[PDB]
């Protein structure tokens, strides 16, 4: 069923769907064909394929794929399973009063981030002077548990945003009057 | 005139001010002296200064400095020129109605960015259905003319932010009811 995100994220999702835990190896041609059948630009995919060092059989290991794209293989193993989980029917609710605006995160990670924001907010009382502390605590949690470096914002009122982030690392949500925007970038 | 920004940004500004020869050569002892005069902490300066492969003649070239620090050499050449203009009393005024909240951008880039936001906004009518297009135009302009990748936000209301940006590449400003946040992250 449906597949979502930027072109690079869709290629990564398709690689993870073809990948099998037993060997973590994906056929280059099968990856290209799946990208074609999901309408990705031909030039872009061919340019990505040239970045991957395939073996003599034309197979890309998950490690080589992540290395070439600046991804963390251990993290992509977890993403693979957390996405399979929801496709298999084992989805979870979001925590109470969480409204997701947009996201590229796996569902488990969405629960993790929104529950930590609610926990940090509950300890400070949610006044504007306490919001700097909440933002710093949420950024610290994200930087440590999910790698550096995270852009972290809380705002009230209306907003419009065009932004760039590492694959699957972005989430925009609302709890009451607070809008929370988090995403990861390199370094 | 006064240094601004992070310790790393201040050390880079000092490097560019010291670089006053045709070969882009800076004397490492002179750089340390400037950092000491500007009360930059020794622990951080020493960590950065060890990232450079000084020639054993105690000299660092702009190119070596930029490579060790993850800066684009051509951008730093232009940054030096723009900052010196301001030091010389020859900077541009900010355009009408622009209130700068925080920035480590050079003055000429601050003028260009806030000017471009006003022009993109003036060609739409300023309505909320049109602001997604304003933000997209600004981000695309910045990505192309000043390198990838730019984060771009327009907001009405209040905000709290912890974020990370490349040296000199961040600007927050207000024009009328709109607060505009822009900054660049790697890649």
Numbering used by the authors:
A (entry chain B), B (entry chain A): 4 to 190
The article reads:
A unique family of proteins called calcium-binding protein (CaBPs) or tegumental allergen-like (TALs) proteins are abundant in trematodes. Among the F. hepatica paralogs, FhCaBP4 is notable because unlike other proteins in this group, it exhibits calcium-dependent dimerization and increases hydrophobic surface exposure upon calcium ion binding.
The asymmetric unit contained two FhCaBP4 molecules forming a homodimer with a two-fold axis. Each FhCaBP4 monomer consists of an N-terminal calmodulin-like domain (residues 4–90) connected via a 10-residue flexible hinge to a C-terminal dynein light chain (DLC)-like domain (residues 101–190). The α1 to α4 helices form classical EF-hand motifs, where two helix–loop–helix structures are connected by two short antiparallel β-sheets (β1 and β2) that flank the Ca2+-binding loops. Five residues (W163 to S167) of each protomer in the extended loop interact with five residues (Q’154 to V’157) of the neighboring protomer in the β4-strand through a pair of hydrogen bonds. However, a key deviation was found in the flexible loop between β4 and β5 (residues Phe166 to Phe171), which displayed significant conformational variability despite the conserved sequence. The elevated number of interactions in FhCaBP4, particularly those involving Glu12 and Glu78 located in helices α1 and α5, respectively, indicates that the calmodulin-like domain contributes to stabilizing the flexible loop within the DLC-like domain. The calmodulin-like domain exhibited an RMSD of 3.5 Å (79 Cα atoms, DALI Z-score 7.6), whereas the DLC-like domain remained structurally stable (RMSD 0.5 Å, 90 Cα atoms, DALI Z-score 20.0).
